[PDB]
Structure formats: structure tokens, C-alpha cells
Amino acid sequence: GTPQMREIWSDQNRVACYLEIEAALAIVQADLGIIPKNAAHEIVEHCRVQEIDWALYIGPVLGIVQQLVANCKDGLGEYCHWGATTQDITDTATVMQIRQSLTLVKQRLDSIVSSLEHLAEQHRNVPMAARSNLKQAVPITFGFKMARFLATFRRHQQRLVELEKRVYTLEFGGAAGNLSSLGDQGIATHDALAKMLDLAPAEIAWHTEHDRFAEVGTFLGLLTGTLAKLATDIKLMSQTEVGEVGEPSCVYIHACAANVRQGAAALLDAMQSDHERGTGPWEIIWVQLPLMMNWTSAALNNADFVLRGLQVFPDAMQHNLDLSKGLIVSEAVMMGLGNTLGRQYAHDAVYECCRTAFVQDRPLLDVLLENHEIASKLDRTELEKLCDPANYLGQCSQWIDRVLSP
Amino acid sequence: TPQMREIWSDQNRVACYLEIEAALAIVQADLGIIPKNAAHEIVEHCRVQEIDWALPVLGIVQQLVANCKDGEYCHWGATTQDITDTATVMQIRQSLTLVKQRLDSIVSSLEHLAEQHRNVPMAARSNLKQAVPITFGFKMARFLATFRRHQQRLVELEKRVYTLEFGGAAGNLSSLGDQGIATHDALAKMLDLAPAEIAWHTEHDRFAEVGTFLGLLTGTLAKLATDIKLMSQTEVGEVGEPFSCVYIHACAANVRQGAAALLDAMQSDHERGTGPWEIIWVQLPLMMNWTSAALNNADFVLRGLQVFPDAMQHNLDLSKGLIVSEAVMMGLGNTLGRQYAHDAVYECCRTAFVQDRPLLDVLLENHEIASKLDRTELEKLCDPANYLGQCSQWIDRVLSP
Amino acid sequence: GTPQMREIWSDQNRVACYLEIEAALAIVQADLGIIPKNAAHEIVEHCRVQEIDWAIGPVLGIVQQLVANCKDGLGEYCHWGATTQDITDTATVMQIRQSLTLVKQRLDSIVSSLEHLAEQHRNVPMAARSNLKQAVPITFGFKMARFLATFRRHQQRLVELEKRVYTLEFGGAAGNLSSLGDQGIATHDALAKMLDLAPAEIAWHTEHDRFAEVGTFLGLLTGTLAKLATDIKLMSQTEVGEVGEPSCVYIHACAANVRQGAAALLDAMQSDHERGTGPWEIIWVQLPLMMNWTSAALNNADFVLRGLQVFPDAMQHNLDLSKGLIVSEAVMMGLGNTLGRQYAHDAVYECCRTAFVQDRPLLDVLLENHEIASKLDRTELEKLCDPANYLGQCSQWIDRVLSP
Amino acid sequence: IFGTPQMREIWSDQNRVACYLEIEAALAIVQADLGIIPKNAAHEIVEHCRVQEIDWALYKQKTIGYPVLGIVQQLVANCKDGLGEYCHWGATTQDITDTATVMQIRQSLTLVKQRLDSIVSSLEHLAEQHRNVPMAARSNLKQAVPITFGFKMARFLATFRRHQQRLVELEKRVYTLEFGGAAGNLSSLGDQGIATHDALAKMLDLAPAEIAWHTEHDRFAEVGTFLGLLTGTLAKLATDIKLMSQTEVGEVGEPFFSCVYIHACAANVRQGAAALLDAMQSDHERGTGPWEIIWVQLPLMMNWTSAALNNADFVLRGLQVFPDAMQHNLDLSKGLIVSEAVMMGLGNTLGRQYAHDAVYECCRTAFVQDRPLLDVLLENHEIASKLDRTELEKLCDPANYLGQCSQWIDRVLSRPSSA
Ligand SMILES: [Mg+2]
């Protein structure tokens, strides 16, 4: 994890969220006439994270009320935590930390997206071998490869924005979700509290309805899945025998993605929570979510750093493109010779010349020139042109433009 | 289940294959890529009633060339994964149509149960121990709100998933030259799919996104199933099943692990990868079938659900008033101190518990309380049905969108 | 986490394990003539766990402080021929051995508690449940003996994996200890004997079946703990009240976290070629977490079982809910001798169905059948309707589990 | 993928039902010997306990979810004079399904044992063949130091032997009879329940259970976790083979007369193992939910594993090894890969501390300049004066720094020289 994400989920931002929730609750309930107005004023003033005795801290939030109610003057502590249950404070605090977490994620995605836009543009036309099952296939450009990551990271951005409206929601339902101890002021307290914390008011309690938190986990799984692919591709291209790129780090992403994807499965498990309250499933989320958020930030940090100083070697990419000695663009030689020699003789002639060039480990050009019909109907510099892998890039540049233009 | 197994059959699958091949041949003729003799000849032999049914895409395309007279212009510029993944997208669209219909029925049934049992009192439970009274319609409304969120998640992923995959060997359609993008764009319109911003042969977020949604959806169904068999325990008997929630449990367990496999599959190298691709090809059909089975069972169980309010009333009376000790605290905090009401009535709950007797009987033995409230409701304060909170209004909030 | 279990996995005990390997390594290489006996003495003295200045370089940072503490340049005879993963993974093995020692102690106490509960409540009748619906009568000791057998099998699994896991990892950069020449195997075998570890048959830096196997065992073990927590807390329902806890909800989360961690460890087995940071770091993270989650689950189960709250009266009350329907099967057998096996079936089944729709005891409805009242009078029909008289061979099955 | 034909046949409806009928037949025989049912009835039941008399239409359709009863209803109504009504006596459905699954697992593990046996033999063969073939070891896909291909094969070989030990160890727990009735106590069998169980177990060549285990799923999950551990090794093998067969590497070649399929198998099997661990959370005495997880995952995991085993067996049997490519890749760093050997070789002639410092920075010089480490070392006037070139060029030879690869292989093969 990164210091930045690490302290978002520290005990200390956590209770700071607790105190902000208790302070907001007292103001709303004093504004509604539920608690004395002066009591809320004293409670809010002692809602400072610099006033907890960390040494005197079994009871997650109650330990913070015990030091709040027994801290205020004239028993004005009476009145904090009025009508709230423990999970109301934990889950709304968790929601606040998620929003802080996703702020970092959005910033990391922006830098990554920007790095990819630059790499896609810079290396728009740098030829390299595309690879299928780690075997060379047909030529592409490195910029084309980067544009495919860019489009994926943009889709992830869309997913992040879509879940925020569901996830950024208040949890305030009391013991069983109906806020029974507040009478006909429960919904009013809830709706104003959400307001006060800049959170969407809940349509109903969700203490055992964990689709909001699990949806965050599954998004982290989807996102780190893409980061793992980026890390794998980069260390594949920086192999000693490949050497097409160089790191300015990606091995850490692999572990992060593997841990996060299993954590997302655990959060789905937690969705099976019985009746109105369930400690067990709740404890899964209490453990996994901060772990997955920290793993994801480490992966994003490494990917961001690697991409910003990523180093590209077009000489190595061209060298690897030349390994097949013409065979990689055998399809191009088929069509290019179809106008001069006939649609099918071109197919049959280069295919048979392709087998020979393969079995003899010779350039495809050299075997084509051993065909007298080839050597008499079309000269060598036009056959070299067709055998050059750099002349068979397709519409990589226009596909790149299509990604860069939104 | 049959409709879901029909979508993912070898044979709806090949029908999807032939439709893509037919549509590709048509657009390629309109753009001047393939001759109009052959394009028209390929369309007729795009019949699943013409596959002789003895064993992927190339096996059906190799027959198709040796099928429509003299056809070898079909599959032009396309790779195998173009056909399989676009067919998978088409099957996902049909799959999600079934899911939308089942969710509609489930949401409608929950709209029932919230209204009927809006005021049916029952004991809420925390760690399977009674807490405070609620209503059965309130419990159903919390399920209804969740399923509505799932519906929104479904619509949101459709715009991404319903996309064409047509990129060729390495995604750049090199064999199509300056007609690659045009062929792609035209194929998408002909299949009513959005054109891709770029190839995604190894970019598996669309397919994994479908899986994680199935995991989120089946997670809620698993909760509904567990709560239902918990409420139908012999010792509880507050509901029943019509006359199969146990089948939902296994469906969700398999779907959630299958989603982890799809996230794993996103780790796919370079431009093509059979390994990770095969994870999706296996798990996605399995997860769809498990989800449809779970949805059908949930739909049927909710469609004819069993409710017994005097079972809930009997269970509410088990603690003999202790479950509504909070209600006595509020009503008694008006005459005494609200905090004094806490400590005095809590102390009464203790003796009422250790001696197994009602809270009403022990409260009357405290001279301070017996002076602030008469006998008649110390009852209704101890009556669990008089401490339901704003359950009915919370239900209205869910029913109104 | 638990107190004894962090500090096994604390950076302190880890660094202590690092220093023991380096100390043992120097002794081994001095006896073999690889390094001069100065440093074995000087390096061993500075392999104190209270001389380290706290503050990547997991292992390299600790040897840097070992060259910097030793005399006269003697300190760069330490770590000779070793790679970082040799020290980390051998430490992990030592920490796993310390971890499993706790697990065996917890398993012994849990087994001991179940042996007592199986004997105490051997004849305490209760309702068995299928899909959370009552089935036929059993005894509470029968339920406990079934847990006892499972934990005994778990004990067997732990002992079997110990001989594979308690193995040295000392292979150098690529496993062949190139820099040690013809002394590599001799160094390895002597070092393993110095640490009371089995010598490896070969290097296993990217062969993670030993570490993953530990994780799958934790998954199997916490799975049984998760069932125990579910049954106890299903029996502690307000509407059931058959047991009470003296603290099982935590086990549920522990088991769920362990089982996904085990899947991550299996994933880590996909490690390329001779060294792999990616997969190795999965294990570095998951193993300590799963050990602490498992120790917490074992602590709770141990405490809950030792102070288990058992109420036979509630078990008897729940047995009587069906009012004889629970032992309808026994009523047919006793009366099948007189009327015939299935004639008894259909007559009793049809009486049971009637007793259900009328919410009346099965004895009352059976006595309204003139044919049944002719083959058996009341004392016997009511003995047959007593759920306590249809426990099968529960007690004998208890003996089968208790007497090994 | 789909799985091998035998493994597909082991978990087919045909073989499963055949297992049912063997259990019912064995139960009838045991209970006739105990006087619980008449012998003529047991004899008539055994004669009709044959899978070739089952009408698959009545079972495939209209079977409402009756795994065993659909076959028992056809055994009762198949036997003459209503003698079939004596079958299934005292047994519950899960007794028949679980015991059948046990017998199917044993048949499955017979295949796995045979496949592991062949794979081990290929690895012993490959380890011996290429015991001295030099190649570059790789760390994070970067070259590290020289090893031999046989050393790499022996590291797989040692792993599979440990897997073979795990297989044998769980067999004694898994090959167990499940016969406990409705709640595990065989209530309807009275004082004959235990006698029926022990005799039925011996009749099926299974260990008698210590007690019922209808919701105690440690045996089945343990099978799943073993398949996870095993396919994990197979996935590493498939990954290493695909890495060594990259166009830019070309060190091995698959027979192709297959490794990518292993990756998907292992990924699905390891997630299935997690689901089986989840199934262990089964309440009270009977649980359809958790039991159905196992019913689904186990056959899938067995078929995925055999597919992975079949591919690995085939690939290892016809594996093409290219020592020239391995040698070509060893020479890529032009001596940098054995810089450590050059360090040690020069310590006596130059001083061990100068040898470290001088040769180390000569390496980065050779790296940034893309030149042989030999050429840069000769440009060091102190070295070039104490050291002729034919002697440095032995120290710069990657093939002269293999360590004890050969002897480590001996340990794995159990050569008499290893002891
Ligand atoms: Mg190694």
C-alpha cells in the first residue's frame, strides 16, 4: 500500500470519520428539536480527533462515545449517538473512506490514461510483432498496443463513476433498520444526516444488504485485472530475449491483482448475511475492503510510475520482427502478388515458398526469387517491399485516432 | 434451466456464427470487398438446418466454403475469436433478456409482499438472536430496494457489453487494408451492436463485468434463500416455500467462484490468448445457467410465498416483553429522566430474565414506575406490535420509485 | 490475529529466524573449511536479536547490519552462497513449524473438549435437522462425536504435511548453488541438519506446493470450524435455545478469508522458471494472514467448546413440537410386526397426515384407528411415540469414535 | 476443456447409476446374510441390479429430481413377485450418492495415478537426457545464471513425487463408506445398523466410517484441494513450456502431432477447490445446498484435471528440446551471465576485493556498450597483464559455471551415487 491510501484506512481517519458523523448527527437532531441545542454545540466542539487518548482504545465506536459522553460537561454527552447503532457509524464511515479512496483511484487513473495517450501518440507508427499464445502473428505498432490499454482504462473510469452514486450513501437505520428509538423522527433524522455528510439518503436500511460494498470490491477486481495484464505484457516485452521495453515494479502488481480478485470473491460471500444484522459477514468486509484498497493503490502507483518512465526500444522491436525472415507477412505477399501473377498462383506459390523458407530457415524473399515466374514478372525491390514487415501495419494509426478522439 | 440452456446450446451458438458470417458477407459486398455473386450465395447456406451436426468456427466455416457452390469469400478478414466473442455477446444479450424478465417478476412479487404484510409484526434478528420488532413487509422492501439496484447495474453494463468484436488476427484487420474500420462499423450496425473503439481480444473487462454482476445478483438471491429457510425452520415456522431455496445456495457459491475465474482470465498476454479465453468460454455458460436456475427458484418461491403472522406473533412474545424494552424506555422517559428510564428499566429486564417472568409483571413492582404509569399500558408499551417504528413509511419510500 | 500468533509472524521473530539461519550457515561453512573460523565466531556473536537497528531489502538490509557490526571485515563471510529467498523461505518454514505447534495444541484441547461432551451428553435426546427442518431423533453426544471424528482426520492431515513442509530451502541464485562449487550439497545437508529440517531433494524457489499445501490445510480446518460455529449459533437461536455460548460469528469471517487465501496460494503455484517475485509475494502476504485468521478461529472454538452451554430441557421441548410425528418411522416398525411392514406404513402415514392437518398428537390419532388400537394398547403406542425411544445406535457410534 | 474419455465416462450418468446398483446389490446381500431381508429377495434384487435394464427415458425425463429413487423405483418395479420392495432397506438417498461418488473418485484417482506415473517417467527420461545441456536460468523473466535443462526438469519431477505422496495419503481417508440413513444413526435398522454398515463397507472394498459424514465434507474437499495443488504444478509446467517456446526463445517445442488448455483447467480447478471448502459450511445433519456444490464441482474438477494431465503427459512424451537455441540464449549477455564466476576466478590473482570491484564495473561497461565481457576485461591493463586471454575466456564461458546441477538431479532420480 501507499502512504496516501494507508492513512485513509488508518484507525485515525476512521475515528475522525466517527466523530464527524456524531457531530453531524447532533446538529441535525438539535435542528429537529430532538436534543437540546446547547448540547449539540458542546458535543460538536469535543468531536476532535486530537482529543482521543489512543492509549485508552473490544468496542470499535462505543469506545469513542465512552470518551465523548464522559468527556462533555454537565452530562451534555447524554445526547450524542442518539438513536444510532454501532454499524451505522462503521458503515457510513466506511462509505466516507471509500469516497476518499476512490478520489485517489480517479487521480491515478487520470495519470495512467494520460501516460497512455502520450505513448499511443508517440509510438503510433513504431512497428512491432503482435503475439498470439506468445508466438509471433502479424505486425502491429506499439502505439496500437497502448491504445488498447487506454480504451480499457476508460471503460474502468465509466464503471467507477457509475457505482459512486450507489455507494456514496448514508447508513443510518438503528438496531433493526427502522430507527425505532427515534419514533416519527427517524426518516427526518436520516435524510438530514445524509444531506449533512454530502451523501445520498438511503432508500432503506442495508445493514445486511452488502451489494454496495461488494460492488466496490468487484470493481477493484476488474481494475487490477487490467493492471495485471499491463504488468505481464511489460515484463514479457522486457525479457532478456525480447528487450522491446524497459522499466524506469510490475511484479508487485501481479500479487496485488491475485489478492484483490480473491478478496472480491470473499465480499460476494459476505452478501449472504442473514436477517437484519450479521457480525460474521460484516467482519469479512471489515477485513477485505481496506486490504483490497491498499493492494489496488500499490498496483496503480507502480503502473503509473512504470508508464510515466516506460522506455521503448524500436530497434529491438524491428529485430524481433525480422526473426521470421519474411514469413510474418506472408499474407501480404499473397495479395500483393495477386494482381501480377493471378489470385491463386500467388496463394499457391508463396505458400509453397513459405514451407521451403521455413524448413530451410531462409528468407522468404530468397525462396521467392528461386521461382522463375516470380523473378521474371516482378523485380526484387518490389518483392523486398512486400517482404518488409513494416509495410503491413493495417489501420493501426486510424484505430489509435479513434481511441484518442473521445 | 431450459430457456437458458437453449441460448448457450451448441446450436443457437452456430446460428449466431452463421448470422455474423452472413452479415459480414453482406456489408463486404456493399463496400466492394467481396463479389456480389458470392455474398448472396453465402446468405442462403447460413442455415443451422444444413449443419450435418458431426462436429469451432472453422469447422463450420470450412463446410460453408465447400457448401455454397463456388463461398471462399466468406469469413474474409475475420479471425476465429471475432466470431466466437461476437456470438458470445449476442448470447449474453439474449441471456440478459431472460434475466430482465425474471427480475421484473421478482421485483413485482416483492411489491406485493411489502404491501400485504406492511403491518405484520415480526421479530428482527441480529446474529440469529431476536432484536426489536419490525414488519415482514419491511423485510421484503429491503430485498426490493436491493434488486432495483441490481436492475440498474444490469442496464449500465449493457452499453459496454453489447459491442462488436471484429479485429482479425491481431486486431488491426491488416488483410482488409483501408476497409478494415469501415467493415467493422457496418458489421456492428447490421448486428445491432455498438462498434468497438478498438480490438479487445485479450481485454476481458466486458465479459468479466458480466460475471461479477452475476455474482452480485446471486449474492442477493443467496441472502433471500437463506432468510427463507431460516424463517421456515421447524422451531420458527414464520414462512414456508410454495407447494427449493436450497438450490440457490449452491448456485451463488459456484457463480461467485466463477467470477473470480473471470477476473483471473483478464490476465491475458499480448493480442491473443487461448488459455484465458478458455476460462471464459467455460465459466460464462456455467454461470449463466446457475444464475437462471437461482432466478427461477427465487421467482417461484416468492410467487407463492407462505406467511403465518401468528407464528411471528408467537415468536415475538417469546421474550415476554423484553424485546420491546426500548419501547417502555421511551414511554417511561417522559415522566422520569430519559436516562433514568434507561437504568431503571434495564435493571428490571435483568430480574425478568433471570426468573423467566414477563417484563410487565416486574415493572409494576417498582414503586417509582408503578407511580408514573398505570397498568393498562404498561401493557401496550410491552406489546411488541406497538413498537414498529416507521416501517410503513420506509416501505412507501421504496415503493414510490 | 492472536497474541502468540502475531509474534510468530512479527518482524522480530522473522529477523530472529534470519539471524539463526546466518549463524547456522557460518558454522556449517566453517566446519567444511569454506570460510575461516574467525567469522563463524564473529558472525555468530552478532546474530543477536537485540543488536539490530530497526530501520526494500528484507534480508539484505539485515546482513548489511551484519557486515557493519562484525570485526575487521569478517562480516562478509556471512550469507555466503545464499540468496535472499533461501533465508526468507527457510524462515517461513520455521515460522510455519511454530505456527503448527500452536495449532496442534489448540486441536488437542478442542478434541479433548469434544471427547468430554460426547461422553457427557451421550444419551441426551435431541432432534436431528435436514435443511433446518426436523428429521429424526439423535443425541447431542452423537452430534459432538461427528465433529470429533472430523478434527481427528484434520490432526492426521497436519502430521502428514509436516514431513514435507519442514524442509530447508538453500539453493542460491538459481537452485544449483553455483558459487559453492562441489560444496553446495554438503553445505545444504549440514545446514538442514543444523536447523532440524529435512534436506531438500532439490531447489523449490518457484515450486510452492509445500506452502500452498499448508494453506489448503488451513482451509480444510477452518471449514470444519465454520460448521461448528454455524451449528452452535444455529442452536443458540432464540426460538431454539439448545446451547449457549460462554464468539462464533468471528469464525465465519475467518473461514471465508482463509478459503479465498488458499485459492490465492494455489494461484501462486503458477510461478515461471527459477525465480518469481510476483507469485512469491502472494505467499508472503497470504500465509501470515491465514495463520492469524486460523488461530483466531481456533481460539474461539476452543473457548466456546470448553464453556459450552447445554440445555437438555430445550432439546426435549423442540423434540415434542411435532407431537410424535418426529418418530412416525418408529411407530410403523413396532406395529408392522402385527399388520405387515407396509400395511403399517400406509396406516401410520395416513394417521400422521391427519395429525398434521388437525394439529393433534399422533398418539391421539393412532388411538382413533380401531385396527391399530386392536394390535397395540396405549402404554406401547405412547412408548413408540416417545422420541427418546428412537435414538438408534447413537451411543454405540459414540463408542466407535471415542475408543481409538 | 471437456476432459478425457475415461474420466468423462467415470462421471457419466451411465457409470454413476451402475455404482448405485452395485451398492443396492451389495446392501441386499449384506442384509440377507444378517437376516434382515429374505435371501430369495436379495438374489432377485442382485439379478436386476444391472444398468443395461434401465430405461433412460423414464430417468432422463420426469426425473422431478430423483437421482437415486428414480433408479430404485425401477429396481422395486423390476424385480419379480414384488421382491424389489426389499431393496434400499434402511438407506437414505445421500448414502447411495456419496458412496457412489467415493467409488467414482477411486476410479478417477486410478487414472490420475496412471497419468502421474507416466509424467514422472517422462521427467526422469528428460532429466537424464539433458542432464548436461546448458541453459540460462531466469528470474522475473530475466536471465540470472546458467543451469541445465535436466536440472529444470528434475525440479518438476520432485514436485510430482510429492503430489504422488499426497494422493496416496488422502486415499485411506476418502475411500470410505457413507451409510448412515436419515440422520446418520440408521434408526430404522435398530441394533443392526452398525452391522449392516461394516459388512457393506467390506462388500464394496471401502473402509468403514468411524461415524456418519453427510455434512462433514472434509474428505470431498480434500480431494478438491489435491486437484488444486496438482493442477497448480501442471500450470507452472505449461507456463514454462510456453515461455520456452516463444518465437524469440525457441528452446523447446510442443509435439503438436496443448499447454494453453492446462492454464484454463488449473484456473477453474482452483476456484472449484474454494467452492468445495465453502461447501464444508453445512448445517446440522443434512444440507442440500452445500451437498449440491460438491455434486456440481467435483465432476467438473475431475474432468478439468484429467484434461490437464492428458495434455502434460502428451507434451512431455514428445517434447522437442533445442540445445542450440538454449546455447544461443546463454551467449546473449556475452559473458555477463557468469560475472560471478569471473569474480571468484580472479580473486587469488588480483585480490578478492579488487576482483569484485574491477570485474563488476567492467560488466556494466560491457552492458552499456553491448560488448563481450571478455573484451572489456582485456582493456583493463592490470588484468591484461596478470591474465592471458585463453584463461579469461574459460572464466567467461557460461558452460563452465553450472554448479552441481548433475548431482542435484542424481538426488531426485535416487541414483546410488546420491546416497
Ligand atoms: Mg531457483
Q: CATH number, domain at C128?
A: 1.20.200.10
Judge if A40 and A163 occupy the same domain: no
Cα D144 to Cα C287: distance, rounded to the nearest angstrom:
27
Rounded to 10°, the helix A211-237/B205-231 angle is 150
Judge if A137 and A21 occupy the same domain: no
Instruction: Looking at the complex, report in whole angstroms how far the Cα of residue A112 sits from the nearest Cα belonging to chain C.
Output: 21
User: How many angstroms separate the alpha carbon of residue C84 from the centre of ligand 1?
Assistant: 11
Cα A394 to Cα A127: distance, rounded to the nearest angstrom:
11
Cα A263 to Cα A288: distance, rounded to the nearest angstrom:
6
Q: Which of C256, C263, C400 sits opposite D271 (nearest CB)?
A: C263
A139 contacts in B (CB within 8 Å)? 170, 174
Cα C36 to Cα A94: distance, rounded to the nearest angstrom:
59
Q: Which of C175, C226, C396 sits opposite D155 (nearest CB)?
A: C175
User: How many angstroms separate the alpha carbon of residue D406 from the centre of ligand 1?
Assistant: 15
- After which residues do gaps appear in chain A, with C to N over 2.5 Å? 57, 248
Judged by CB atoms closer than 8 Å, whether chains meet at B271 and A132 is answered as yes
Judged by CB atoms closer than 8 Å, whether chains meet at C263 and A259 is answered as no
- Residues facing residue A123 across a β-bridge: none
Judge if C32 and C152 occupy the same domain: no
Judged by CB atoms closer than 8 Å, whether chains meet at B318 and C267 is answered as no
DSSP state of C309: E
Cα C81 to Cα C94: distance, rounded to the nearest angstrom:
20
Cell output for A313: 526500444
Cα A333 to Cα A241: distance, rounded to the nearest angstrom:
28
Q: Which of B131, B150, B170 sits opposite A130 (nearest CB)?
A: B170
3-state secondary structure of A177: coil
User: In whole angstroms, how far apart are CA A54 and each of A50, A59, C52?
Assistant: 10, 13, 28
Cα C235 to Cα C230: distance, rounded to the nearest angstrom:
8
**What CATH code is carried by the domain that includes residue B350?**
1.10.40.30
* Closest alpha carbon to B83 in B165, B151, B156, B7: B165
Indicate the Cα dihedral angle D299, D303, D306, D312, nearest 10°. Answer: -140
Judge if A238 and A248 occupy the same domain: yes
Judged by CB atoms closer than 8 Å, whether chains meet at A269 and C256 is answered as yes
C276 contacts in A (CB within 8 Å)? 251
Kindly report the number of other CB atoms within 10 A of residue A276's CB atom. 25
In contact, D346 and D395? CB cutoff 8 Å: yes
Task: Write down which chains contact chain B via at least 3 CB pairs under 8 A.
Answer: A, C, D
Q: What are phi and psi of A136, to 5 degrees?
A: -65, 140
User: How many angstroms separate the alpha carbon of residue C91 from the centre of ligand 1?
Assistant: 17
Kindly report the number of other CB atoms within 10 A of residue B350's CB atom. 11
Is C51 contained in some domain?
yes
User: How many angstroms separate the alpha carbon of residue C83 from the centre of ligand 1?
Assistant: 9
* Closest alpha carbon to A319 in D370, D138, D372, D146: D370
Angle of CA points C150, C155, C158, to nearest 5°: 125
Cα A140 to Cα A131: distance, rounded to the nearest angstrom:
10
In contact, B130 and B319? CB cutoff 8 Å: yes
C286 contacts in A (CB within 8 Å)? 259
Q: Which residue of D has its CA nearest to C270?
A: D236
Q: Which of A152, A211, A274 sits opposite B149 (nearest CB)?
A: A211
* Chain mean position to CA A161: 12
Judge if A187 and A42 occupy the same domain: yes
Judge if A187 and A250 occupy the same domain: no
- Identify the domain boundary among C306, C332, C349: C306
Is C402 contained in some domain?
no
Q: Which of B128, B234, B318 sits opposite C234 (nearest CB)?
A: B128
In contact, B195 and B163? CB cutoff 8 Å: yes
Helix ranges (DSSP H) in A123-184:
142-167
In contact, C169 and C195? CB cutoff 8 Å: no
Task: Write down which chains contact chain C via at least 3 CB pairs under 8 A.
Answer: A, B, D
Q: Which residue of C has its CA nearest to D403?
A: C178
* Closest alpha carbon to D301 in B208, C263, C219, A255: C263
In contact, A169 and A205? CB cutoff 8 Å: no
Helix ranges (DSSP H) in B31-79:
36-44, 58-65
Is A318 contained in some domain?
no
DSSP state of D145: E
Q: Give the residue numbers in D contacting A (CB under 8 Å), as ranges.
A: 136, 138, 140-143, 242-243, 245-249, 260, 274, 278, 329, 332-333
Cell output for C243: 446451547
In contact, B165 and B199? CB cutoff 8 Å: yes
Kindly report the number of other CB atoms within 10 A of residue D407's CB atom. 16
Judge if C243 and C116 occupy the same domain: yes
Is C76 contained in some domain?
yes
Angle of CA points C287, C290, C294, to nearest 5°: 140
Angle of CA points B271, B275, B280, to nearest 5°: 95
Instruction: Provide the residue type at C169 as one letter.
Output: E
Q: Which of C133, C233, C238 sits opposite B318 (nearest CB)?
A: C238
User: How many angstroms separate the alpha carbon of residue C265 from the centre of ligand 1?
Assistant: 19
A232 contacts in B (CB within 8 Å)? 267, 269
- Identify the domain boundary among A281, A312, A343: A312
Judge if A65 and A153 occupy the same domain: no
Helix ranges (DSSP H) in D280-351:
288-317, 323-330, 339-350
3-state secondary structure of B131: strand
Cα A396 to Cα A139: distance, rounded to the nearest angstrom:
10
Judged by CB atoms closer than 8 Å, whether chains meet at C132 and B264 is answered as no
User: In whole angstroms, how far apart are CA B93 and each of B15, B89, B159, B215?
Assistant: 15, 6, 11, 17
* Closest alpha carbon to D126 in D329, D320, D344, D376: D320
User: How many angstroms separate the alpha carbon of residue D135 from the centre of ligand 1?
Assistant: 13
Cα A393 to Cα A332: distance, rounded to the nearest angstrom:
10
Angle of CA points A42, A45, A47, to nearest 5°: 110
* Closest alpha carbon to A148 in B270, B109, C212, C73: B270
Tell me the Ramachandran region of residue D353: left when phi exceeds 0, alpha when psi lies from -120 to 50, beta otherwise.
Answer: alpha
- Residues facing residue D138 across a β-bridge: D143
Cα C388 to Cα C137: distance, rounded to the nearest angstrom:
7
For D290, residues 6+ apart whose C-beta sits below 8 A from its C-beta are: B249, B250, D215, D217, D278, D279, D280, D281, D282
Cell output for C49: 536479536
Gyration radius from chain B CA atoms: 30
Instruction: Looking at the complex, report in whole angstroms how far the Cα of residue B337 sits from the nearest Cα belonging to chain D.
Output: 46
Judge if C194 and C233 occupy the same domain: no
Judge if A118 and A76 occupy the same domain: no
> H or E element: which one contains D134?
strand D134-139
Cα B208 to Cα B226: distance, rounded to the nearest angstrom:
26
Cα D171 to Cα D105: distance, rounded to the nearest angstrom:
9
Cα D412 to Cα D419: distance, rounded to the nearest angstrom:
11
Indicate the Cα dihedral angle A73, A74, A79, A85, nearest 10°. Answer: 70
- DSSP assignment of D59-119 equals HHS-----TTHHHHHHHHTTSGGGGGGGTTTT--HHHHHHHHHHHHHHHHHHHHHHHHHHH
Cα D415 to Cα D419: distance, rounded to the nearest angstrom:
7
* Chain mean position to CA C155: 8
C264 contacts in A (CB within 8 Å)? 258-259, 262
Q: What is the count of residue pairs from A and C with beta carbons less than 8 Å apart?
A: 67
Residue A127 CA neighbour count, 13 Å, CB half? 18
Q: Which of A235, A238, A241 sits opposite D329 (nearest CB)?
A: A241
DSSP state of D274: H
Method by which this entry was solved: X-ray
Instruction: Looking at the complex, report in whole angstroms how far the Cα of residue A9 sits from the nearest Cα belonging to chain D.
Output: 28
Judged by CB atoms closer than 8 Å, whether chains meet at A284 and C251 is answered as no
Judged by CB atoms closer than 8 Å, whether chains meet at A134 and D278 is answered as no
- DSSP assignment of B315-368 equals HHTTTTTGGGHHHHHHHHTTTS-HHHHHHHHHHHHHHHHHTT--HHHHHTT-HH
Judged by CB atoms closer than 8 Å, whether chains meet at B235 and C318 is answered as yes
Please report the beta strands in C92-249, taking only residues with DSSP state E, as ranges in sequence order: 125-130, 133-139, 243-244
Domain count, chain B: 1
In contact, D28 and D78? CB cutoff 8 Å: no
User: How many angstroms separate the alpha carbon of residue D145 from the centre of ligand 1?
Assistant: 10
Question: Looking up cell 449452491, which residue turns up?
Answer: B250
Instruction: Looking at the complex, report in whole angstroms how far the Cα of residue D376 sits from the nearest Cα belonging to chain C.
Output: 23
Kindly report the number of other CB atoms within 10 A of residue B376's CB atom. 7
Is B378 contained in some domain?
yes
Q: What are phi and psi of C139, to 5 degrees?
A: -120, 155
For A3, residues 6+ apart whose C-beta sits below 8 A from its C-beta are: none
| Selected residue of A241, A250, A271 to mutate for chain D interface (largest D Cβ count, 10 A) | A241
Strands D142-148 and D134-139: antiparallel
Cα B131 to Cα B229: distance, rounded to the nearest angstrom:
19
Kindly report the number of other CB atoms within 10 A of residue C61's CB atom. 14
Judged by CB atoms closer than 8 Å, whether chains meet at D340 and C179 is answered as yes
Residue C173 CA neighbour count, 13 Å, CB half? 23
In contact, A255 and C278? CB cutoff 8 Å: yes
Instruction: Looking at the complex, report in whole angstroms how far the Cα of residue C281 sits from the nearest Cα belonging to chain A.
Output: 6
- Polymer length of chain C: 404
Judge if C142 and C111 occupy the same domain: yes
> H or E element: which one contains D147?
strand D142-148
Is D202 contained in some domain?
no
- Residues facing residue D321 across a β-bridge: D252
3-state secondary structure of C255: helix
Cell output for A52: 482521543
Kindly report the number of other CB atoms within 10 A of residue D158's CB atom. 23
Cα A218 to Cα A268: distance, rounded to the nearest angstrom:
8
In contact, C147 and C224? CB cutoff 8 Å: yes
Judge if C152 and C184 occupy the same domain: no
Cα D404 to Cα C185: distance, rounded to the nearest angstrom:
8
In contact, B346 and B332? CB cutoff 8 Å: no
Cα A140 to Cα A122: distance, rounded to the nearest angstrom:
15
* Closest alpha carbon to B177 in A388, A398, D311, A342: A398
> Whole domain around residue C198: which residue ranges?
1-82+172-203
Is C404 contained in some domain?
no
Which residues sit with Cβ closer than 5 angstroms to ligand 1, an ion? C 174-175, 203, 205, 274
Cα C120 to Cα C309: distance, rounded to the nearest angstrom:
13
For C189, residues 6+ apart whose C-beta sits below 8 A from its C-beta are: C199
Kindly report the number of other CB atoms within 10 A of residue D209's CB atom. 22
Is A56 contained in some domain?
yes
User: In whole angstroms, how far apart are CA D308 and each of A275, C264, D267, D271, D338?
Assistant: 43, 20, 11, 15, 37
Cα C91 to Cα C21: distance, rounded to the nearest angstrom:
8
- Identify the domain boundary among A260, A282, A312: A312
Tell me the Ramachandran region of residue D190: left when phi exceeds 0, alpha when psi lies from -120 to 50, beta otherwise.
Answer: left
Cα C229 to Cα C235: distance, rounded to the nearest angstrom:
10
C237 contacts in B (CB within 8 Å)? 128-129, 233, 235-236
User: How many angstroms separate the alpha carbon of residue D160 from the centre of ligand 1?
Assistant: 17
| Sign of the C-alpha dihedral computed for residues C68, C71, C74 and C78 taken in this order | negative
This structure's resolution (Å) is: 2.3
